[model samples]
Target: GSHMGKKCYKLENEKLFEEFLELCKMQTADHPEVVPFLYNRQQRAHSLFLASAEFCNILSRVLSRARSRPAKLYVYINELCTVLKAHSAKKKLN
Candidate 1:
């Protein structure tokens, strides 16, 4: 059967944020997989995968300096949590 205009691959934003938090917390032997994991998905849409791309930047920025900047990292992560939590709770009104 044919489909609609285009196939949609929804990003699990909550899961992505959750993954980010784990990485924040002393996380990952698998932590490095996050970026690559994102890239491995669709490179097709702006909204669909663009979030993934932005997350990669923040992911690396946060992870790269995590050990060296523990004091500031908590500040960053705590603030980051509030924003993401706000979005996640807002949910799909539809």
Candidate 2:
């Protein structure tokens, strides 16, 4: 049910992904009486949780910097968005 929009090369690719989730479920099954969250049901949920945590940590540091320097925040974000939008428009142009 979860493989929607994903690029699966083989019939067994989804099976492999399921196996990974099963392993995570088994590994955690005995380890902890855990709290449930959205990431838990995601196939790559374990890795996704770790990755999202890292992203949030990085985002916190970025926000800290932005809080210290308000002008830089606007300039930094605007320039970043401008570059991204330009790149996106270029791709669409082709």
Candidate 3:
């Protein structure tokens, strides 16, 4: 029962991951300056960018995991939500 539920959630998360990534990309496209942070600093940028990449990486891993971890999922989701919201606010200000 729990196994089946985990599989179902994995499928749902996969869909959500795709949708969220697409939206994130669109926001970045609309504001290229948004990602200057990715290139400016050296080690700091690498760490920050790695964290961002892990959001998508974890989503992929979820598809193969035997059980889902809600805390990990929520962390990535929160990071993504914060990024998009911040970018939206920045755009509105300019």
Candidate 4:
């Protein structure tokens, strides 16, 4: 369901979204509602949600500026991807 006027995080980079999902997994057990809150436009004032949002926002800002340094961006992107894949796989088992 849509949470009107709320800003759901968005990433043009698929790797980033994957990383974000992994980050969400770490917090979901303690805040189950956060999964939908991440995908949907809902209100969540929890520390995990707030922290994840901040993390994404910072990465987005850095990425926007790193457009000229493709190689550098590639490194960070892949690192995050690896982290995401590992986390996602680990979480899938539970």
Candidate 5:
């Protein structure tokens, strides 16, 4: 059945993830709050940093859901992937 097949998929975090709150805090470190951001870094590096932060938030949410409902963890992953992939595809145009 579809439900059982979905249940069999594995839910794992390939990248180390930080909680949403932590991600926000880390990004603010270089703002006017703590210290100014160094300009030596390329624009691409900054963009990649933001993407990594967003991905961490995604992984954190996935891990949290898996812990809450161990049985439906794979289902949760599939849903999250579907949503994120759609968003990423949309963002590619910008």
Candidate 6:
């Protein structure tokens, strides 16, 4: 194995990795409980704009696992999926 110097080893990204694994392998089955973050808009804008839309949130929602639906994240998946849906709908109408 190769070394990553002296500061990189905990594997926090892997935790996120697992969260996404759950959502993707079991998207319908996956969910957040929704109490606090159960529904946030601004925070989501950050994640969705920066995280999901960019391509990484897809990783978190599917593999790493959210634990509970804090309501803070997970929309771009819909938007990502939705972006396609709307396009198809509009294109058909077009």
Task: Give per-residue CA lDDT, model 1, range 1-94, as digits (tens).
Answer: 2332443323544354445556554543434453333332212223433254444444455545665675565544643433333333233321
Better of 4 and 5 by TM-score: 5
- Two-way TM-score contest, 1 vs 4, winner: 1
Q: Candidate 2: where is the Cα deviation over 4 Å?
A: 1-51, 75-94
lDDT (CA) per prediction: 0.42, 0.34, 0.38, 0.41, 0.37, 0.34
The local lDDT score (0 to 100) that residue 38 gets in candidate 6 is: 20
Kindly report which residue stretches of model 1 are placed more than 4 angstroms away from their true locations once superposed.
1-51, 82-94
Clashing residue pairs in candidate 1 are none
Decide which is better by lDDT, 1 or 3: 1
Quote the RMSD, in angstroms, for model 5: 14.4
Q: In candidate 1, what residue range of length 10 has the lowest lDDT sum?
A: 37-46
Model 6 misplaced regions, further than 4 Å:
1-6, 28-65, 70-73, 76-94
lDDT over C-alpha atoms for residue 72 of model 2: 55
Q: List model 6 lDDT by residue over 1-94, tens digit each.
A: 2433333312432344334434434544354432112222222333323222323444344333344542323543343344333323223421
Q: Please state the error at residue 73 of candidate 5 in Å.
A: 0.8
Q: Number of the top candidate by TM-score? A: 1
* TM-score of model 2 vs. true structure: 0.27
TM-score of each: 0.38, 0.27, 0.29, 0.31, 0.35, 0.24
TM-score ranking from best candidate downward: 1, 5, 4, 3, 2, 6
Q: What TM value does model 6 have?
A: 0.24
Give the per-residue Cα lDDT of candidate 2 at 66: 47
Predicted model with the maximum lDDT = 1
Per-residue lDDT tens digits for candidate 4, residues 1-94, read 3442345444333344445445555534665554454433212222232334443554564355445454454344444433333334224331
TM-score of 3: 0.29
Residue 55 of model 3: what lDDT? 35
Per-residue alpha-carbon lDDT of candidate 2 for residues 4-63, written as tens digits (9 for 90 to 100):
243333324233333333433444454332212212222222233222333234334434
TM-score of predicted model 5? Answer: 0.35
